[PDB]
Amino acid sequence: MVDATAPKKRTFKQFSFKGVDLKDLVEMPTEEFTKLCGARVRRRFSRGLDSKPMGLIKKLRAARAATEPNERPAVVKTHLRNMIVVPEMIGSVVGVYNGKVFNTVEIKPEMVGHYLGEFSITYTPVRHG
Amino acid sequence: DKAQHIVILDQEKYDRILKDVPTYKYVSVSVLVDRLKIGGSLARVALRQLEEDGIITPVLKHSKQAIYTRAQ
Amino acid sequence: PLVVQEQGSFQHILRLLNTNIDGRIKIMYALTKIRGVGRRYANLVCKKADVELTKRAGELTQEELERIVTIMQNPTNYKIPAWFLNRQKDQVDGKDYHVLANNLESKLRDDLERLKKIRSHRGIRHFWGLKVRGQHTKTTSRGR
Amino acid sequence: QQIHKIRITLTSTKVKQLENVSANIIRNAAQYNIVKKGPVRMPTKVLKITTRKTPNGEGSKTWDAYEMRIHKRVIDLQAPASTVKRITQITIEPGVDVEVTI
Amino acid sequence: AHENVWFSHPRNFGKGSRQCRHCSSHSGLIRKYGLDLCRQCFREKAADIGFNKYR
Amino acid sequence: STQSVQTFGKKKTATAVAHVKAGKGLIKINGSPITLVQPEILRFKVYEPLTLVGLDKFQGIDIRVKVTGGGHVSQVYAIRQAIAKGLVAYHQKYVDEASKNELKKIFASYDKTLLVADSRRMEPKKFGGRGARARFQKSY
Amino acid sequence: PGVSVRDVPAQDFINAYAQFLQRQGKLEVPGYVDIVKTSAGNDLPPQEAETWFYKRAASIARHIYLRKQVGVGALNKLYGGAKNRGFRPHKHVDASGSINRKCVQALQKIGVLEISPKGGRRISENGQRDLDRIAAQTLEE
Amino acid sequence: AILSKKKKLVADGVFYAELNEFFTRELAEQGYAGVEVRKTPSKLEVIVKASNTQGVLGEQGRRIHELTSLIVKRFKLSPEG
RNA sequence: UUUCAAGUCGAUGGAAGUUUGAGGCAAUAACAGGUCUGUGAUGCCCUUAGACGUUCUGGGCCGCACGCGCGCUACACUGACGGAGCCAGCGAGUAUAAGCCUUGGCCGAGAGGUCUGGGAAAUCUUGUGAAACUCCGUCGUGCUGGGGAUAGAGCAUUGUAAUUGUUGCUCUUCAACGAGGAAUUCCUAGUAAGCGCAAGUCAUCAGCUUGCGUUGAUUACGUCCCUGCCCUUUGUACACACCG
Ligand SMILES: [Mg+2]
Ligand SMILES: [Mg+2]
Ligand SMILES: [Mg+2]
Ligand SMILES: [Mg+2]
Ligand SMILES: [Mg+2]
Ligand SMILES: [Mg+2]
Ligand SMILES: [Mg+2]
Ligand SMILES: [Mg+2]
Ligand SMILES: [Mg+2]
Ligand SMILES: [Mg+2]
Ligand SMILES: [Mg+2]
Ligand SMILES: [Mg+2]
Ligand SMILES: [Mg+2]
Ligand SMILES: [Mg+2]
Ligand SMILES: [Mg+2]
Ligand SMILES: [Mg+2]
Ligand SMILES: [Mg+2]
Ligand SMILES: [Mg+2]
Ligand SMILES: [Mg+2]
Ligand SMILES: [Mg+2]
Ligand SMILES: [Mg+2]
Ligand SMILES: [Mg+2]
Ligand SMILES: [Mg+2]
Ligand SMILES: [Zn+2]
């Protein structure tokens, strides 16, 4: 086995997703971004983007443009919880239906590539006793 | 857990094998394992060579069963 | 192709990647004791290192032992396919990796908080210790 | 377009009318000196459907096993096309359907 | 507007994509041999169609 | 042509068409020698019709069989029946019937299935269970 | 009288044709043979790493000899076996397509087989010639 | 269009089953017994057996004429077929 | 043997001598048995425009401290893998669709992708070259190469949509389980037991049923001891009939 050492190094590290750091990630077009994520995401964008996902992105873009003192970009509500989070919509706040209520989530960078409804549980957890 | 059968053949066991196997009515994989304390894989290579060396006569040939007897 | 004998060369206990390996196990199945090394993976690193599988663990010399730990730590450098690896398309740097004994639980852990930090549904059920892959829990998994 | 090698395919659910039409055509192909090949008994097909007896879902699990036997016969004739078609109208039967292929 | 929403969800390749000839039901449909009949509707029409019980 | 008789033997689903022609004694299984039967432990089932009468009976006849259907074991019983029936059928047609009745005596006294096909077939499965007679386990 | 492939046991004929094909060395072996498993239903690669490709090609040659226009899809089903689904019952799963397609392609460049009309892969004019030869050098002992 | 043999004999039966119930609902008051479909070249003969053949063939056979029209328009049959 | 009767048990012949094997149908009445969640089958009650009609979106029917039932994998060597041998039967399959069965060729470790062709079918898929099985090897009684849950990362397919992973594939993790208490189920010959395959549901998903075939036994061919039912006799203050 010889030996082993683990001296971890840094350089003012910016958050990075699969070799692409946050700076370049956000202004990459979503066409380019999907080429470096999982198989399920890659298949979905090849199948054709219907109007519903693209319409939410347009509203989400406008909601950030409404405010330019750099605070939270006001909530956009939606039912479409099969939305795949893209770097374009990082930092936006969306209200995602869980069947009854608008769960409010703020799009953190580590949420990218996930399904929008995966962060809003649709059922209150069971509590016996 | 108590088996701890020997899998490496040293020199003390090697000549003990060639001194004990001929004095057997019937040798097989289990017979070699049972009394010589060697492993099953080591028994199989020992049988295939002891037959090639002429000490052991093959009564019956089979993958799952090797029936051998003394050649004297 | 015949029985051979040796004295003093066998090594009863091996230490690879800070894990103790029993020396009387066949080499392909001895390495499976190292967590992160399965039967399929151990078969290929031995074939890439030109270590014939017909050898017990203690039979190997030091020269061969170092040659194996080098390959496991650099699989892509030894014509090991990317799809054959443990951790491919890594989350942070996007390169294909194969995590090993002590590194596996660290990055397995780092994946758990990464799921829990974003508070995804899969990460939440992992926190509760419940099944995360959609399994029914009504009637199964009642032990403790 | 004269004498041709002509196939007549016979399918029906019931064999009595099928064999009557088959024999009647063979009979008419005998007194008329027309060389013939057949009839050829194709392996009969058993169309089976197995449903549950209960309209509801209560009781012992009992099943029906319905059947629909389909018998198919093909006969080869060596005659001009005008002769074979008029033979079909001679031996027309409601149960048996006829298709003619050259 | 409304016509683009009313009855807009696809109703193909599904259980609701087909129905019984007789009762227009969605459950217990029989598609073998292109029957497209409910299993209950089939029993009351089997003799007419030509299905008989022999064995 | 020549003295040729064609017969068949059967087991559950296996059917072995025996072409017993005459000749130097050629005996092949699907174009392969009987000396190469795949089930070695069952190699003596097809050797029985040979050693019972004596190989001298096969000097003048050659037999080529084509066995299809059934399973591995069911095919062995189909082959041995086609051979036994083929030897008898040749004697009845091209040899005196006194010899044919002699051969038939030794075969029948040893195994009925050499000449008589086994009539056993699989019982149909009935609903309410996973087998013909077996039923789903009942609970109260 | 002559000797054919059908006159020799299958199991030890392939062991002899495999030995010749390896010592001849002209068969082109793809580069992933030391890595891959024969079938998706299998869980481990073949134990005879150096010789398994030759033996499988020998088996393919013998199997094609006895039939007419067998395809490569049929070869996957033939060498496929029961998959070890964990708790679900066993099932038959076909073998890997590349291994079989490379073998028949490899066998096509050694001269034993060729693409037959109406599909499949016939045995070559020389394919009968050299297989029947190996049969003779099998049964002399 | 192109329909299989298995699917054609079943379709003829299914057509008979649906056609038979249609007469039971429409001609219930006339003692409807059964229907016989006699296929023939260039024509589809249908024989209905009823206790009263006046209610079907009434007022210069108006009902039977207006009843065969309900079958041409539902099974896409030629008016003469 | 027998009341020499109905029959039964043995042989011989026979393809078949258990009703030849197996099923389908199946009497006189009856149950508050189950279904109005099969019906454009229904009486009545409720609702009928802020619908309890119908449609659209999203969730749920899977939700988990627990008790119970039908099952599938297994606990190993009569075995696991690795090569090799290589045999069934019952069935199904499409068009200007809304897309069927898909060989053969070519890519791909696989899963899978692509190009042509055949088949509305004893023709082509298909000999469905299925699995158990057999041979030769590795393993060697070890929670081991038995077992494959749980979980991490990745690759494809179906589908508008896969997150609460549809499913498949690759690597890795490798858990209880070391033959199971009280109890209790099914079964007598090609039967039981294994072992797979097809059809139904089905865009996708079979640890499910309905069938089919491969390999193929142990043990009775008897009894009323337990259990259920039937008959006869008997008691009854029950007859809406002991839920009296
Ligand atoms: Mg809601
Ligand atoms: Mg196979
Ligand atoms: Mg295999
Ligand atoms: Mg297993
Ligand atoms: Mg298993
Ligand atoms: Mg009967
Ligand atoms: Mg009630
Ligand atoms: Mg209702
Ligand atoms: Mg209703
Ligand atoms: Mg219904
Ligand atoms: Mg409403
Ligand atoms: Mg439910
Ligand atoms: Mg849930
Ligand atoms: Mg049940
Ligand atoms: Mg095996
Ligand atoms: Mg066919
Ligand atoms: Mg273990
Ligand atoms: Mg697993
Ligand atoms: Mg008991
Ligand atoms: Mg009981
Ligand atoms: Mg589902
Ligand atoms: Mg299915
Ligand atoms: Mg009384
Ligand atoms: Zn219906």
UniProtKB/Swiss-Prot annotation, chain A:
Signal peptide extent: none
Keywords: Cytoplasm, Ribonucleoprotein, Ribosomal protein
Keyword Ribonucleoprotein (UniProt): yes
Gene3D superfamilies the record matches: 30s Ribosomal Protein S19, Chain A
Transit peptide is among the record's keywords: no
Subcellular location: Cytoplasm
GO biological process, one term: translation
S-S bridge residues: none
GO CC, any one term: cytosolic small ribosomal subunit
UniProt superkingdom: Eukaryota
Coiled-coil region: none
Function description: Component of the ribosome, a large ribonucleoprotein complex responsible for the synthesis of proteins in the cell. The small ribosomal subunit (SSU) binds messenger RNAs (mRNAs) and translates the encoded message by selecting cognate aminoacyl-transfer RNA (tRNA) molecules. The large subunit (LSU) contains the ribosomal catalytic site termed the peptidyl transferase center (PTC), which catalyzes the formation of peptide bonds, thereby polymerizing the amino acids delivered by tRNAs into a polypeptide chain.
Family per record: Belongs to the universal ribosomal protein uS19 family.
Subunit structure: Component of the small ribosomal subunit. Mature ribosomes consist of a small (40S) and a large (60S) subunit. The 40S subunit contains about 32 different proteins and 1 molecule of RNA (18S). The 60S subunit contains 45 different proteins and 3 molecules of RNA (25S, 5.8S and 5S).
Name of this chain's protein: Small ribosomal subunit protein uS19
Gene: RPS15
Swiss-Prot record, chain E:
Cofactor(s) listed in the protein's UniProt record: Zn(2+)
Key words, A-Z: Cytoplasm, Ribonucleoprotein, Ribosomal protein, Zinc
Sample GO molecular function, one term: zinc ion binding
Function description: Component of the ribosome, a large ribonucleoprotein complex responsible for the synthesis of proteins in the cell. The small ribosomal subunit (SSU) binds messenger RNAs (mRNAs) and translates the encoded message by selecting cognate aminoacyl-transfer RNA (tRNA) molecules. The large subunit (LSU) contains the ribosomal catalytic site termed the peptidyl transferase center (PTC), which catalyzes the formation of peptide bonds, thereby polymerizing the amino acids delivered by tRNAs into a polypeptide chain.
Record-listed Zn(2+) binding positions: C20, C23, C38, C41
GO cellular component: cytosolic small ribosomal subunit; yeast-form cell wall
Example of a GO biological process term: cytoplasmic translation
Keyword Zinc: yes
Compartment annotation: Cytoplasm
Organism the protein comes from: Candida albicans (strain SC5314 / ATCC MYA-2876)
InterPro entries in the cross-refs: Ribosomal_uS14 (IPR001209), Ribosomal_uS14_CS (IPR018271), RIbosomal_uS14_euk_arc (IPR039744), Ribosomal_uS14_sf (IPR043140)
Keyword S-adenosyl-L-methionine in annotation: no
Name of the protein described by the UniProt record: Small ribosomal subunit protein uS14
Known partners and oligomeric status: Component of the small ribosomal subunit. Mature ribosomes consist of a small (40S) and a large (60S) subunit. The 40S subunit contains about 32 different proteins and 1 molecule of RNA (18S). The 60S subunit contains 45 different proteins and 3 molecules of RNA (25S, 5.8S and 5S).
Signal peptide extent: none
Family, similarity comment: Belongs to the universal ribosomal protein uS14 family.
UniProtKB/Swiss-Prot annotation, chain F:
Ribonucleoprotein as UniProt keyword: yes
GO terms for MF: RNA binding; structural constituent of ribosome
Gene3D superfamilies per record: 3.30.230.10
GO biological process: maturation of SSU-rRNA from tricistronic rRNA transcript (SSU-rRNA, 5.8S rRNA, LSU-rRNA); translation
Alphabetical UniProt keywords: Ribonucleoprotein, Ribosomal protein
NCBIfam families cross-referenced by the UniProt entry: PRK00474.1 (NF001749)
Family, per entry: Belongs to the universal ribosomal protein uS9 family.
Record-linked Pfam families: Ribosomal_S9
Source organism of the structure: Candida albicans
Gene Ontology cellular-component terms listed: cytosolic small ribosomal subunit
Protein name: Small ribosomal subunit protein uS9
Gene from which the chain derives: RPS16
